Design a binder for this molecule. Sequence first.
Ligand SMILES: OCN(O)CCCc1ccccc1
Ligand code: NI
Length: 194
Amino acid sequence: SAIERISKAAHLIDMCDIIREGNPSLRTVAEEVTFPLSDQEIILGEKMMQFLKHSQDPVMAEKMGLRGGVGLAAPQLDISKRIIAVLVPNIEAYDLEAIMYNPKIVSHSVQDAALGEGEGCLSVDRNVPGYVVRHARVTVDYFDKDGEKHRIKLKGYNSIVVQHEIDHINGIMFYDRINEKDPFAVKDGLLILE
Ligand SMILES: OCN(O)CCCc1ccccc1
Ligand code: NI
């Protein structure tokens, strides 16, 4: 069991725990978690966040052969649960740090946005150029490990990152939102971030 081994106290998540394109799990819609959460579901959230921090540490990422990341979704660990972790650094130490259970976008702006540099994915071993078109702004509802409900409004990079992870729990990949015809086309109402 993926969640079983990953939740072991001694286990440290690394690239070998992350599945890549081709694995059906990434195109499957993750199942919602029920409350109260099991101890394993809470630990998994914590393990995920620990992974993000490790991936962001120079020495850690190096020793563990980790690809840097600011977000991670359970499906990427072959665990089909609606659980995601986000850790966006400020340029406190973080612009956004959260472990979200059953996250859901309850409202979004008409205006769209996309990173000028485009996007990458820990489960995708290749570069796919293009603007990943997303909602500029979103209001997201989610539950924390204690089952408490949170409603937040995101913009800029945080908005992009959370949408990328929520897409994972819905079986969607970043390149699914890039314009096939013109990967770098700038449509009306599209806000390029940079
Ligand atoms: O699932 C997360 N992951 O593969 C790491 C990439 C996170 C990310 C990077 C740039 C723009 C949006 C999201
Ligand atoms: Ni990804």
